């Protein structure tokens, strides 16, 4: 049948490529553990070199269901 609904969902760029470093301008794909703030790769190298930076994805795993052990 045709009648009914259809997924084919989609969404423009609203918050996908809008989270960039205000100092560099590079999409922030990391999260500092010292100041618990978002930062770019160029930052973890300079801005936050000492602090313990972790890929945003990693910081999330914590919020969501527990995660398995892995020696990053
Ligand atoms: Zn930066
Ligand atoms: Zn930091």
Swiss-Prot record:
<feature type="binding site">
    <location>
        <position position="43"/>
    </location>
    <ligand>
        <name>Zn(2+)</name>
    </ligand>
</feature>
<feature type="binding site">
    <location>
        <position position="21"/>
    </location>
    <ligand>
        <name>Zn(2+)</name>
    </ligand>
</feature>
<comment type="subunit">
    <text>Interacts with VIM and HINT1. Interacts with IKBKG/NEMO. Interacts with STING1.</text>
</comment>
<feature type="binding site">
    <location>
        <position position="48"/>
    </location>
    <ligand>
        <name>Zn(2+)</name>
    </ligand>
</feature>
<protein>
    <recommendedName>
        <fullName>Tripartite motif-containing protein 29</fullName>
    </recommendedName>
</protein>
<feature type="binding site">
    <location>
        <position position="24"/>
    </location>
    <ligand>
        <name>Zn(2+)</name>
    </ligand>
</feature>
<feature type="zinc finger region" description="B box-type">
    <location>
        <begin position="16"/>
        <end position="56"/>
    </location>
</feature>
<comment type="function">
    <text>Plays a crucial role in the regulation of macrophage activation in response to viral or bacterial infections within the respiratory tract. Mechanistically, TRIM29 interacts with IKBKG/NEMO in the lysosome where it induces its 'Lys-48' ubiquitination and subsequent degradation. In turn, the expression of type I interferons and the production of pro-inflammatory cytokines are inhibited. Additionally, induces the 'Lys-48' ubiquitination of STING1 in a similar way, leading to its degradation.</text>
</comment>
């Amino acid at each position: 049948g045709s009648s009914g609904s259809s997924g084919q969902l989609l969404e423009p760029i609203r918050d996908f490529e809008a989270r960039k470093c205000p100092v560099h301008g590079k999409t922030m794909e990391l999260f500092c553990q010292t100041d618990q703030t978002c930062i770019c790769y160029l930052c973890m190298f300079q801005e936050h070199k000492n602090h313990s930076t972790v890929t945003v994805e990693e910081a999330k795993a914590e919020k969501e269901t527990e995660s398995g052990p892995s020696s990053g």
